[PDB]
Design a binder for this molecule. Structure first.
Ligand SMILES: CC(=O)N[C@H]1[C@H](OC[C@H]2O[C@H](OP(=O)(O)O)[C@H](NC(C)=O)[C@@H](O)[C@@H]2O)O[C@H](CO)[C@@H](OP(=O)(O)O)[C@@H]1O
Lengths: 218, 212
């Protein structure tokens, strides 16, 4: 029943500001230090900041000192990161993490949030177009059939594809012109399609877009 | 600042074998009779997860095949026996001094038998044609090793770009890779040509083709 629920990630203009939140579900932050860490698009992990149990002690990485503020509110079981003077290279997935609470020194980060995505750019939010990828109505098949969804022309990067009907393959997005393109595939037994429903659900939080595409032959 | 260096950057290991990953700190991470080096696992699309705290302590909930050891400046994480499920990037991190720092990561990959891709090709959907664009998509699925080459031929002639190729991470069950190849063109250019072919090499190439 433990989950660290993050919010606030968004597209922001260079020099802009943004506040991230992290609230503990089924877990108490009271009694424990906490950190923020980010994963930049190259997939490296970078420690950002920490804060002690009651908030007496705060420390910042060299890359964010003077621009970011870590704080917490234990009565609301919440951790915050206030970001300001944002620049391009702050673009990253931001995780909150609770520390272990052992005596005898410092502690590892034992519980981590799901990550919230921050993009720093002058470009504008563009929702995705979603196109089905299904074989032709006549086409011979078997034993399995591969289906997919093509997600095209969106910015910023963070989209999630979910299938409802199976091996799902997720292909990382790539930049075409100013916009992102990604695809996802799923493989289903020949006998179960098109008779049984298969749907890809595509979400792009930055534009508040959620698209469900039902896969049909042709 | 304590700088962490991991070795190797990538390590390939067969299922059932012992995998050993190394982390060297630029100065000691020991104090109070403990060593403040911690290890994390990160799988794609998932947050980091704590494996080992304070150099040698297994975190509750983590499989017993993980262990760690070391002191001062040298630390080791051991995965034994390695499972298909362990494909991930593994990080060391120190907390002896603020600012806290991570190592650069070590990718664990599984060594496995060669496998040819299953290839699927998709013409532009009517929806997209209706919109005014045209993308032709090819999936090459469940192949090994990761190094494979894809080429497109349009009416017999090789289209080298407007082509976007993207690989998955290694599959956590069968240890294969998959990739998507997308050829984007104008609707008008799409309809000017007849034959479309996506081809995988690496030779006896595997091919899928259609005609308009
Ligand atoms: C020396 C020590 O305890 N260091 C830990 C450090 O401590 C900061 C601060 O924490 C408490 O203050 P509140 O913030 O008011 O709780 C502590 N007070 C009491 C009553 O214990 C102060 O004495 C102390 O100065 O904080 C960090 C984490 O926040 C610790 O790291 P880990 O979380 O990694 O353990 C560090 O050990």
């Amino acid at each position: 029943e433990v989950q660290l629920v993050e919010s606030g990630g968004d597209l922001v203009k260079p020099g802009g500001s943004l506040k991230l939140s992290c609230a503990g579900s089924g877990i108490t932050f009271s009694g424990y230090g906490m950190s923020w860490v980010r994963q930049t698009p190259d997939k490296s992990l970078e420690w950002v900041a920490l804060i002690s149990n009651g908030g007496s002690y705060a420390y910042y990485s060299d890359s964010v000192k003077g621009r970011f503020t870590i704080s917490r509110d234990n009565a609301k079981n919440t951790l915050y990161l206030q970001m300001s003077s944002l620049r391009s290279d702050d673009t990253a997935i931001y995780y909150c993490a609770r520390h272990k609470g052992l005596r005898g020194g410092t502690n590892a980060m034992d519980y981590w949030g799901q990550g919230t995505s921050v993009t720093v750019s002058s470009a504008k939010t563009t929702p995705p177009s979603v196109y089905p990828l299904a074989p032709g109505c006549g086409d011979t098949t078997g034993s399995s059939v591969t289906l997919g969804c093509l997600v095209k022309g969106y910015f910023p990067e963070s989209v999630t594809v979910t299938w409802n009907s199976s091996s799902v393959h997720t292909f990382p997005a790539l930049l075409q012109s100013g916009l992102y393109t990604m695809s996802s595939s799923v493989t289903v037994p020949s006998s179960t399609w098109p008779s049984e429903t298969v749907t890809c659900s595509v979400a792009h939080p930055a534009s508040s877009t959620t698209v469900d595409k039902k896969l049909e032959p042709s | 600042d304590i700088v962490l260096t991991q070795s190797p950057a990538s390590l390939a290991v067969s299922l059932g074998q012992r995998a050993t990953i190394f982390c060297r700190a630029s100065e000691t991470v020991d104090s109070y009779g403990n060593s403040f080096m911690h290890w994390y696992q990160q799988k794609p699309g998932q947050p980091p997860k704590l494996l080992i705290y304070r150099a040698s302590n297994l975190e509750s909930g983590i499989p017993a095949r993980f262990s760690g050891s070391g002191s001062r400046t040298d630390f080791t994480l051991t995965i034994n026996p390695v499972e298909a499920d362990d494909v991930a990037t593994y990080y060391c991190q120190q907390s002896n001094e603020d600012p806290r720092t991570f190592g650069g990561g070590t990718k664990l990959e599984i060594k496995r038998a060669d496998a040819a891709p299953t290839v699927s090709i998709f013409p532009p959907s009517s929806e997209q044609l209706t919109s005014g664009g045209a993308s032709v998509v090819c999936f090459l699925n469940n192949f090994y090793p990761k190094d494979i080459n894809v080429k497109w031929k349009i009416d017999g002639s090789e289209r080298q770009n407007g082509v976007l190729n993207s690989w998955t991470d290694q599959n956590s069950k069968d240890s294969t890779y998959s990739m998507s190849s997308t050829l984007t063109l104008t609707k008008d250019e799409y309809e000017r040509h007849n034959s479309y072919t996506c081809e995988a090499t690496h030779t006896s190439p595997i091919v899928k083709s259609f005609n308009r």
